[PDB]
């Protein structure tokens with residue numbers, strides 16, 4: 167059985183219990199913490215690409231009001247985010263299972279941009295998601311996994327100083 171697990175969930179849960187925020191810039195900002203995934207149960211000899219996208223967790227705009235995050239009243243449909251290909255893709259099952267798959271080079275932006283960067287809506291809440299795509303073989307297959315622990319609101323600057331402090335303490 168293909169098992170997908172979150173590396174350093176202890177640290178993510180510190181961020182989650184304060185409401186995590188991720189900076190987005192015109193040029194794109196790398197994530198901290200970085201999404202690292204533990205993968206077992208692949209065919210060491212089969213070929214796979216690892217894909218990362220961000221699901222809008224709800225249809226609302228959020229705002230930091232009197233030291234607390236609160237959803238707007240006026241939901242709108244949120245089109246799904248573009249997908250980021252892990253730069254080691256495509257690769258053998260063995261490659262992916264020998265160490266945590268680290269999405270350290272993904273950059274989050276608020277502007278439609280050349281390429282690489284993933285555009286998110288500022289003040290929307292996001293749930294990171296990966297797709298493991300078996301490629302090259304005859305039988306294409308996809309396995310998807312969500313990481314609730316890694317939820318965040320996309321912000322152009324930190325609102326909760328407790329988050330600012332955690333980001334620095336653990337970088």
Ligand SMILES: CC(C)N1CCN(C(=O)c2cccs2)CC1
Pocket residue numbers: 215251255256299301
């Ligand atoms: C030209 C460049 C953008 N390539 C597109 C395909 N790609 C993959 O690893 C994928 C395979 C199956 C689904 S995605 C990365 C390399």
